[PDB]
Structure formats: C-alpha cells, structure tokens
Coordinates of C-alpha atoms in Angstrom, one line a residue:
Chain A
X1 CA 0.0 0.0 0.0
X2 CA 2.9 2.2 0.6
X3 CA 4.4 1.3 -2.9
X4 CA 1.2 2.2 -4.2
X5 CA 1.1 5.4 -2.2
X6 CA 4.6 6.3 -3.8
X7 CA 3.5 5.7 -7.2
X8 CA 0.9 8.7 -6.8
X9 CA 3.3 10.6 -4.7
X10 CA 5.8 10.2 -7.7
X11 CA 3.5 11.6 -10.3
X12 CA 1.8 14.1 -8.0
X13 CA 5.2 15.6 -7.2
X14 CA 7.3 15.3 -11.0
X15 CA 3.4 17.7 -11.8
X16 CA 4.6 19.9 -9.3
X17 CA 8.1 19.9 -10.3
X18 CA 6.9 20.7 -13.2
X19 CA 4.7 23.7 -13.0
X20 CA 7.4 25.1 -10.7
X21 CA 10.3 25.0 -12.9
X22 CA 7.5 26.3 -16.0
X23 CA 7.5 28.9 -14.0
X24 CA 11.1 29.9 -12.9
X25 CA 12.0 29.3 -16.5
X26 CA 9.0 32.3 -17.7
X27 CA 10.4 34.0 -14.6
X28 CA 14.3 33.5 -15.6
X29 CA 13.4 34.2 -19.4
X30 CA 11.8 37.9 -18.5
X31 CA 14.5 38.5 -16.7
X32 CA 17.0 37.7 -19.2
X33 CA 15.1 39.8 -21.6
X34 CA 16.9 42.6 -19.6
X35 CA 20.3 41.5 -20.9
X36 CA 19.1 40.9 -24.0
X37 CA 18.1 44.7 -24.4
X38 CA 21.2 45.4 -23.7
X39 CA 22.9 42.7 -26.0
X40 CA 20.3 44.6 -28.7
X41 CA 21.7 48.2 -27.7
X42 CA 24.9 47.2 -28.1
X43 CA 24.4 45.2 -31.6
X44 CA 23.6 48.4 -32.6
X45 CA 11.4 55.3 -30.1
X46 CA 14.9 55.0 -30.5
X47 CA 16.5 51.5 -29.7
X48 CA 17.9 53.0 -25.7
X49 CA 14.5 54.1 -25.2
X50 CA 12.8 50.9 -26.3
X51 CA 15.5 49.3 -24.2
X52 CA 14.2 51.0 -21.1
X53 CA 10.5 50.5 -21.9
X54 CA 11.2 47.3 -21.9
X55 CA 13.3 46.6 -18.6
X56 CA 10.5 48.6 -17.0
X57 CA 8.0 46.6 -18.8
X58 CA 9.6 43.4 -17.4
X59 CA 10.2 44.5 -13.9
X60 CA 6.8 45.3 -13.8
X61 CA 5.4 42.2 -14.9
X62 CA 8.2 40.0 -12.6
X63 CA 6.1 40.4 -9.0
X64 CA 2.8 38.7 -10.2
X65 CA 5.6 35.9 -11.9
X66 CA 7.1 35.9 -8.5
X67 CA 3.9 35.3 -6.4
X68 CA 3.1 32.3 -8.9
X69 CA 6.4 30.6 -8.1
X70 CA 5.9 31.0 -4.7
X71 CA 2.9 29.6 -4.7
X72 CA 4.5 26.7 -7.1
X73 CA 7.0 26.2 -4.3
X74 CA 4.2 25.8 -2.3
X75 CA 2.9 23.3 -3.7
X76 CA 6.1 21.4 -4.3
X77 CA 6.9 21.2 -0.7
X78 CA 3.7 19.8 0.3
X79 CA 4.3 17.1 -2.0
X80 CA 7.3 16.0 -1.4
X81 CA 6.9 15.8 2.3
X82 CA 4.1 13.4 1.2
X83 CA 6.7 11.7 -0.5
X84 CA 9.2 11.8 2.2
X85 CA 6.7 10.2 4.3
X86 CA 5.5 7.6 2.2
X87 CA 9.3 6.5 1.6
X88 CA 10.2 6.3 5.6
X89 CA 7.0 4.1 5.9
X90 CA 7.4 2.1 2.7
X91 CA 11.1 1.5 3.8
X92 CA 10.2 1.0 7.7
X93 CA 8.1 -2.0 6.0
X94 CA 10.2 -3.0 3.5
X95 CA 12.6 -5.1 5.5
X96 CA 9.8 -6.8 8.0
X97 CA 7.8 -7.6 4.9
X98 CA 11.0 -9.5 3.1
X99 CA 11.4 -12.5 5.7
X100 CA 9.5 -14.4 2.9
X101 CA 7.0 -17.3 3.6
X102 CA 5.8 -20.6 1.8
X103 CA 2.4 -20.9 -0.4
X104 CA 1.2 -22.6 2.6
X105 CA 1.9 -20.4 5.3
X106 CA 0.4 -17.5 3.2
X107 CA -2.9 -19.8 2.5
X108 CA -2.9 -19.5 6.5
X109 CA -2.3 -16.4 6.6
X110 CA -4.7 -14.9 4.3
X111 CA -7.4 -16.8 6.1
X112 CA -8.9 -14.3 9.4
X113 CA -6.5 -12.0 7.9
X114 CA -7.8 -8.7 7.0
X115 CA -7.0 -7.2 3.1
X116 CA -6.3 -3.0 4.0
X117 CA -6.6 -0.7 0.8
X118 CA -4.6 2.6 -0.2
X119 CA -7.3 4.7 1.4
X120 CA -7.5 3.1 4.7
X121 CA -3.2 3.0 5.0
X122 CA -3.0 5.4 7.9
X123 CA -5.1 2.6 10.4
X124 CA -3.5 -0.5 9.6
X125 CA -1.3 0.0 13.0
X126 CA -4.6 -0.4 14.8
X127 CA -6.0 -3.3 12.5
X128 CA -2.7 -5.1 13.1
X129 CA -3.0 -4.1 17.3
X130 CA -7.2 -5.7 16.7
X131 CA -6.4 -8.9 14.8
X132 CA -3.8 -9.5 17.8
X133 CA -5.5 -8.9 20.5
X134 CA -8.0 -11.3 18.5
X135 CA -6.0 -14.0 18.2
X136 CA -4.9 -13.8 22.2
X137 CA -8.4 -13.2 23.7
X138 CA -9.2 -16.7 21.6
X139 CA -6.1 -18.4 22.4
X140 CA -6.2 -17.5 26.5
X141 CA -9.7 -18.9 26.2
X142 CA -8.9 -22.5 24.8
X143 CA -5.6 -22.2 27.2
X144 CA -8.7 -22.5 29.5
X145 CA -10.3 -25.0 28.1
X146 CA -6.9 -27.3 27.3
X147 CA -6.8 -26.8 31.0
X148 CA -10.4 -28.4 31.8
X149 CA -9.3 -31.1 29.5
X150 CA -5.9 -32.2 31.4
X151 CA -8.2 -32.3 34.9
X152 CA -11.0 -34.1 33.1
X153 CA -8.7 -37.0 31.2
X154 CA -6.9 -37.5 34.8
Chain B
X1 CA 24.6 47.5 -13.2
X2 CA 25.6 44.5 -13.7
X3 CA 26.7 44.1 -10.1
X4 CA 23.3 45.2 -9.0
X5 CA 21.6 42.8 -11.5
X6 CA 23.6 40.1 -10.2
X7 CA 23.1 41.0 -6.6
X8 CA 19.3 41.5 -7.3
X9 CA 19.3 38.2 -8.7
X10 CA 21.1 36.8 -5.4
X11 CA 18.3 38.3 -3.4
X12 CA 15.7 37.0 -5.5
X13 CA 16.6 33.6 -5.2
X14 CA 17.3 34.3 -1.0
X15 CA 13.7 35.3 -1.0
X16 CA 12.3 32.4 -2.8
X17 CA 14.1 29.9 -0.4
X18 CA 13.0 32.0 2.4
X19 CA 9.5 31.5 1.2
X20 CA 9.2 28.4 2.2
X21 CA 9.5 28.8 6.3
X22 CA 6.7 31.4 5.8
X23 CA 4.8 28.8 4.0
X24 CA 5.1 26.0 6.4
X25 CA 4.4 28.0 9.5
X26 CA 1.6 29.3 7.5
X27 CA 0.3 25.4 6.9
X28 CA 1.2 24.7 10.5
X29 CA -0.6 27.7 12.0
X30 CA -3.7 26.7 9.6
X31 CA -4.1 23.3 11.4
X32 CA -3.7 24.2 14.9
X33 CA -5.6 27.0 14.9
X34 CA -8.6 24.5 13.3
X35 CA -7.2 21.8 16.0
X36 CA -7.8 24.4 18.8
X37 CA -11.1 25.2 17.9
X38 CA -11.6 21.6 17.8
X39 CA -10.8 21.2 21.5
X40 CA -12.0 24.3 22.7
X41 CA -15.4 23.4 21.1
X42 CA -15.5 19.9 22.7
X43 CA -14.3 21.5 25.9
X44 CA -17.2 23.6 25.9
X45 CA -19.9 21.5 26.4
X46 CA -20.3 21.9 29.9
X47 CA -19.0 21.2 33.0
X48 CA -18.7 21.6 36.4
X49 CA -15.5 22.5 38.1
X50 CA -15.6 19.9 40.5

C-alpha cells in the first residue's frame, strides 16, 4: 500500500516539479530579456529608449511571476513531504515484509486476515493491534479449556 | 549595473528559499488553529468545576 502510495506521490510531485520549474524558467526568461536589451543596444522610439521600456516593462510584470512561483514552491513542498513520508513508511516495511513465507503459510495467513486498501493505509497500526488482541483473547480462552481437559482426562 | 543585477538576482533567489518557512508555519498555524477550535469546542460543552 505504501508502494502504491509512492506511485501517486511520484507523479503528483514530478506535476509539481513541473509547474514550478514552468514557471522559474518564464520567470528567468523575462529577466534575461533585460540583458538581451542590452545585447540589442549594443548590436547596434529609439532602440535605448525601447531598451528601457522594456526593462521597465519586465520589472513590472516579474512580481505577479514571482507570487506564482511561490505559490508553485508551495505546492512542491507539500508534496514531497508526502513523499518523504511515504518512503520512511514504505522502507520502515520493507525489510519486516522480506522475511519471505511458503504458499502454505500464506494460505494460512490470508485466512482471518484482513486485506487494507490505499485509502484506509494510515489505520493499519490499529487493525494489526485488533487482529492481535484477536487471536490472544481466543487463544487464553482454549488455554482455559486445554486446561479443563488435562483435569477431566486424569 | 551588472553588479546590482547580479546582486538583485542573489536576493531573489534568498527570497524564494525563504518563502518556504513562511509557507510552512503558515500550513502549520492553519491546522492548529482549526485543532484548537476543535478542542476548545469539545471543551465547551459543559462542566462543572468539581
């Protein structure tokens, strides 16, 4: 379920990734249009003033640029905290999970086991705590009744 | 100009990592001020001091 979790997480965060470098790159390109009028006034309405216009032009438009990235980054952090998390749990599994077992044993243990989905991840520490406390509420009570049997057969 | 432009760009990009503590407190602050409501509301419902 982790796995699966990560799979999303990977996607969900390469999007982010995306739109936030999309925009640093439209951010970085109007900002090199700067040095490009000056590339353009050196190559050389007149072309200084048009020069200016547009460096003002640009440093106007760069804020509302800016406060998009920001909120890109913001984005982008949230998700790959989400990833971070879903690796630490993935990885805290990962080695209890590789001990391996037999076709039989997992017959057995697929039987009064529960099956948890994606969605319902975050409370499979208490289904695992329930299905014990299961088994050892049953198991105390034929304890019990092994008992009666030892004092009835002597 | 070119020094300012390049020290412009310096502080741009100090800003934009600097966004990011802004943005988690702000997250953070969000959900415990909605937490602490929570409580507050469930502590409200009446009670006797002894």
């Amino acid at each position: 379920l982790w796995r699966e979790k990560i799979n999303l997480l990977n996607a969900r965060l390469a999007e982010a990734q995306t739109s936030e470098e999309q925009l640093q790159s439209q951010l970085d390109l109007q900002k090199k249009v700067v040095s490009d009028c000056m590339q353009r006034y050196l190559q050389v309405d007149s072309d200084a003033s048009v020069a200016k216009a547009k460096l003002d032009e640009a440093q106007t438009i760069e804020s509302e640029l800016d406060k998009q990235l920001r909120a890109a980054n913001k984005v982008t952090n949230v998700l790959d905290t989400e990833l971070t998390l879903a690796r630490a749990a993935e990885r805290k599994a990962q080695q209890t999970a590789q001990q391996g077992m037999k076709e039989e044993e997992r017959e057995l243990c697929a039987s009064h086991f529960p099956v948890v989905t994606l969605e319902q991840l975050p409370d499979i520490r208490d289904l695992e705590r329930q299905h014990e406390r299961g088994i050892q509420h049953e198991i105390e009570r034929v304890k019990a009744e092994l008992h009666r049997l030892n004092i009835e057969l002597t």
